């Protein structure tokens, strides 16, 4: 599963999470109004955001380190750890809702696989 979006920006953090996604969107929005095209590989193992014309990996996040995804209109907030020292990537996409729904499914599947690894039947 691969979707296309425009990398807007990123913020950092060190019902509340829904707000944090929001603050991140605004932050990026103010960024834009004061001043690149990518493709997103969604998988159970990870989320790989690449530079469209080049095909160079921009960010490679092991699904387990990602906690939140949000579709705020045509915008997408990808919250991941270590970069509790988290980072929020903001992308504008034609299909932001589809993208978030897809990552959520990845979450659901990988979580099933998670329980199975720990001897738990999902």
């Amino acid at each position: 599963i691969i979707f296309a979006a425009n990398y807007l920006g990123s913020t950092q953090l060190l019902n509340v999470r829904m707000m944090q996604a929001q603050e991140a969107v605004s932050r990026i929005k103010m960024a834009q109004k004061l001043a690149t095209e990518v493709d997103l590989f969604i998988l159970t193992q990870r989320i790989k955001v690449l530079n469209a014309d080049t095909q160079e990996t921009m960010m490679d996040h092991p699904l387990r380190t990602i906690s939140y995804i949000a579709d705020i209109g045509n915008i997408v907030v990808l919250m991941a750890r270590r970069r509790y020292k988290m980072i929020c990537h903001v992308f504008e996409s034609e299909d932001a809702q589809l993208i978030a729904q897809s990552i959520g499914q990845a979450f659901s599947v990988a979580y099933q696989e998670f329980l199975r690894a720990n001897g738990i039947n999902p």
Partner: peptide, 10 residues
Amino acid sequence: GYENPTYKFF
């Protein structure tokens, strides 16, 4: 918004 139940385990 979607929360990954696996994130909190690591």
